């Protein structure tokens, strides 16, 4: 029933809880939100998932091959340096997907710059915050129709 | 209740499910049964366990001693490249194993070439399709009495 | 309500299901008590929790931020290696943290000399049994006063 | 300071150049009338350049201070993994850059895999063709408003 | 003539010549036999070869394709680690292989994790002694039968 | 001297040389004495050496098997990641020893993550200050009963 | 029918320099001379062209396929090791190449080993002096026809 | 009598097997009597040596020493990145030689990009097929006079 | 007199820019003059080259041999990292070669610790920002007069 | 107030040990003495120190903070590659440094290319023989007023 | 016999070709008889082997073992570097050994520091010609009594 | 003639305090006078030294070319992994040297198959106990007629 989902990995419900420094305000819910409207202005049907667990997110992906999501937007958060398991999930399930960073992982450590999804994503946007979603949105709808 | 243990990591559950010759038409389930049929024929009792989460399947392990399974036929799928936690159970429970591949291992990307399980496992089978959980019992059986 | 959190990560249930075989008599259990008691003798309270999964640590951690805990003590076992889904837990919350290893962990396979978390901690402690676990309470205890 | 620079990289001028596909039609020229035409719609002054050069490249970003510009959209194309001179350029002058790559260049070979210029880029875009200079586009417009 | 040919790599003439406990009291002449009859028992011919000398091996592997013999079962032993020419012998013939060794060779030295053959051999089988062989066999009789 | 020796490494003689932040109140004759009195309340004999020669701090664990120290509770310093003399004095005199660091090694420069000493240590104890030394003290005196 | 062009890399024109040895009389002009003559003798148009520029040889790159060359024969002398901007003009323009090296370049420092372009040519001659062009394009010959 | 002698490693004796498809027609016999004829036609005596034995080729190597051989061309195929025991042959004996491969070695597994020869030869061929020894030959005659 | 030539690398033009607080008070057309001045006080004529085009710098190191340079004094900036190109016309041309960089170049990032020029310099001098050129020069000096 | 302490570290005290043939005459005390007339010529008092011993010279740097040195110039020969205990004496004692080589370490064996000190110090002179103190020490004089 | 077998790798027969340069006056067969007479001299019964092939000096190793040899003096020469096989033989039969190089292979090339025997050898001796030989049957000797 | 000097490294003064094996019994002294007497029965005069401290070995070292020494025998323990320092003194003393150790060296931690000596020794003896010092005079007797 939903053409584009869309997958949160751990840690990314903490956003806006932090502070008035460290972050404002946006939450998880809110990208969700903005994210949902942009695809019904466009007449798409949207879902979105989030968990700390790796098995949920593999459960998650399993089940939108049955549903028929045509296009995956996953940001994996920590889960892209260390789950091949997520890795195998997307690609056994055979559904394109495009890898989002809110953050810029290239500044920081260097075990960040290893991905076990990278090179098997159609793409990857790091570092422009919420709005990575919504260019990914961009791109999927682009090539949806 | 069992002398063998039988466990599936994560993604195993997709065996079949792209069924017109992506995988082929075989099913985690009927592997399944083959190997109980396998085991019924030689008067032991097996059981089998298939989790997408880590924790799943570190929980059974422990069951496992609990239930004085003697050993363990283990294809962790993605989790022998990343799972040290999958290690010390095997190791903290003092279950003998054999590691089980469908695929050649050493046929695919580099990061699967490394094991955390390999090297305290009795041994080995790899690229063999589902034969190769056929011939670890085979050899299980004939280890026990 | 409850004041420093202990977390146990995966296998260290297993603590005590033996002889003298891969430790002697004592239990995850046993730890916790002499933990309660020794926070109860300085007028702090002290939760803990154990899991083997990831996800459940992760989430216990962020209950944490919501409860006020002002310091962790962790022994984050087998996951020191491998979850970086922990770091940004521990990290995204913003409570400083302990390490403590019942074992030296330098002392067995090299890829244990590799943690996800030591860097990011206070200080840590391995080698040392059970005793790990009160030294860091000693320590919290001070730095809290 | 409300002027946008598009750098283009060596060998970018071949896009289009061998007929059909795979990645035909679309050339160099078509994606800056695009982008042009994208930063008129907005009342944005945008420039654009190519050039084999390095040299070349790196003086235009000289210039680029001298004159208005607040931030630089780049394809550093080959130079992102060879040039630290590039990347002095951008730090000498301290505009702001946003990286785009056309292709993933996670997906191909290891030595692409090493940026340059990434950790100091806001962002980086791979993968998602011409589109990756519009969303770094439509970004940078909303950073200045 | 020979349809399926057994190699045996270099030092395996010792098995069961230290007699007391090390090895066991199992010999290379007996694991010979015990193919040879499982083979016939299938109607298939098999054929078998040891030599301590690369070149008497790679010659053998030539003969063999004059010889039109459909499978390969190999236990290279040391020559696994270090052969390219081994290789490129099977390579060049283009004779499906497997690889077996008796002993788990991830148990050992680092230097034994590395092979010259397991990337494009069908599978492997390590660990289980004399009856990795049998396997192989089995497995061999399935493919062509 | 005899039962325990404290051994301080190079440049822990400038602990509380400097006052404000870059070091602060504590001197190492501080440390000393508050070891003292902890092992004399325990009663036992405490010994302690500072050096910023290698040589003399080799010489001093010789001394030391001769007097029939029970166990060395040492802080190498620098030494930690440079000698391995430091290392062999040690297993040579056979004298089982607790590492100390006052600060977090792991969370300063790759260099100092490599010790020539953790792995042959009872176990290692960094980034708790002085209390570090009176937890490895408290562990020693419990030890030698 | 067929353009070969010769491209010569950086520092080449400085071919005779402490004339009676310390390399020897010949000149890159010398050079082009025995090329454009062979070529002559096989009815073949050869053009040829050295820069000090990576720029100016790359745009040469595009040149050639406008002007229909049909093989390139490069040294691209210190840009074998250093240029990926000349590996994409190559592969760019899909122009086959033979590299040619006048000294042996493995014989020399340990950077010299690694090429950007030898696993893309046709193939490669080190170490046989000017020789080696006038082989590449005795090869070059007999391809086209 | 100029003697050069022509050395081709292990599996060269298969070429012109798989006929049509991958590889062609050529054999080494007509190398070898290209090869012979070219020396003829120059007034030098040429013989060559095939073998899959590494020993053959290391006494073969040591004859020409004693019968005066001047130089070698050298195709040691699979033995180029294994055999340091053929390195000291050729160095042991003094007589220069040129290393030929029919293949683009750097084309292939990153394994083949090492050489136990290539410093220690005037200069290597690779990727030109069998015209890479008429080559060598054509040098070889040149430098011998 | 006795030609002596200092080149400056890429982005050395960007002199001073935003001088309070950006270690930048001084021009490149201000440590011209000084160094001209030096020279001229000294009687030695003194030319100075400055390029962000690696070409330009190797085509005036060749005019350099050509008009009897004695010695170069070179800040290759960027280039020192990247470019086997200039270490090659260093070497071709023969002039000996002093190395100078403004910062201390091994207190930056690890990519800055490699050098394609050190090795061959007379010496290096790093950190002492433009003083380190006048040292060059009065070396340069006492070694001609 | 400001001495400036220049130390020479292990062998430096050979210098003049096998005069001939114009390579090693100048002593240690040469240098010496043209430092102190250097410094006295600017007002500046300037110690001197070597030893080959190393705690000797981490000795001489603490007494050095106590007798308000200003500025360290230091030759630490074959302790820079070593010697983590000296650079954490630098450290401690706050003292800002030059490091200086006679000969060009980068020119020598790969081992030499790695300092434990240059990373810290303001700037570093390799290979200008004796004539690097003394630019070290203009430097330094420069730098206290 | 009481034996003592001596094992000469590929290109030993060689000791003996150009006197005053590369290789002194000693041969083979010299350092042989050598052996011979002081084996002879103490009552003990000594063969010797030389082989260019890999395989022959495993066969005669394998030979040892039915003859009682007690221990192996080898001098593997370039198989040390190379051959598994060799140290499987070694280890299969359980002979004791001690390696002998005539020249010091630490001070040549970096890829002759690898041994796949010295780690199970007794000991080596390296560097010391031909009477490391002598040194290492002097040990043999007094180790049988 | 004139000096032979041994010289002892950390640690082995130790030796001889534990029988009847952790290689009891024998004792630096015991080692010494066998060594004298040795000297003594060829009219040699051999001095001995022992330290823990690098900088007394540096000294002696000095102290040996001002006295004469013709050549070292040095067993430098530890120091042979970590000491540049003792490097730099033999190689600027020129006195050559023979490097021993009592035990096999490769076959302990890997940090030990590194040696800052070895390279520049005349040959190295390891595992032979204490007959390998012997086996080193015998043989400087006879270099030193």
């Given at each position: 029933?939903?053409?584009?989902?869309?997958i949160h990995?751990p840690?990314?419900?903490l956003?806006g809880?932090?502070?008035p420094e460290?972050?404002?305000?946006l939450?998880?819910?809110?990208?969700?939100?903005?994210?949902?409207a942009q695809?019904?202005?466009?007449?798409?049907?949207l879902?979105?998932?989030?968990?700390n667990?790796?098995?949920?997110?593999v459960?998650r992906?399993?089940?939108?091959q049955?549903?028929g999501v045509k296009?995956?937007?996953?940001?994996?958060?920590?889960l892209t340096?260390?789950?091949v398991?997520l890795?195998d999930?997307l690609?056994?399930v055979?559904?394109?997907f495009?890898?989002v960073?809110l953050?810029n992982?290239?500044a920081?450590?260097?075990?960040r710059?290893?991905?076990?999804?990278?090179?098997k994503?159609?793409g990857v946007i790091?570092?422009?915050?919420?709005?990575?979603?919504?260019?990914?949105?961009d791109?999927?709808?682009?090539?949806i129709q």
């Open positions: 029933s939903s053409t584009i989902l869309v990995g840690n990314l419900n956003l809880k932090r502070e460290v972050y404002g305000h939450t998880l819910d809110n990208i969700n939100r903005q994210l949902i695809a019904e202005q466009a007449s798409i049907t879902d979105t998932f989030q968990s667990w790796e098995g949920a997110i459960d992906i399993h089940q939108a049955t549903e296009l995956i937007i996953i940001n994996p958060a920590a340096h260390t789950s398991a890795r999930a690609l056994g055979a559904i394109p495009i890898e960073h953050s992982v290239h920081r450590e260097a075990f710059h290893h991905s076990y999804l990278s090179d994503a159609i790091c570092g422009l915050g919420a709005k990575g979603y919504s260019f990914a949105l791109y999927a709808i682009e090539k």
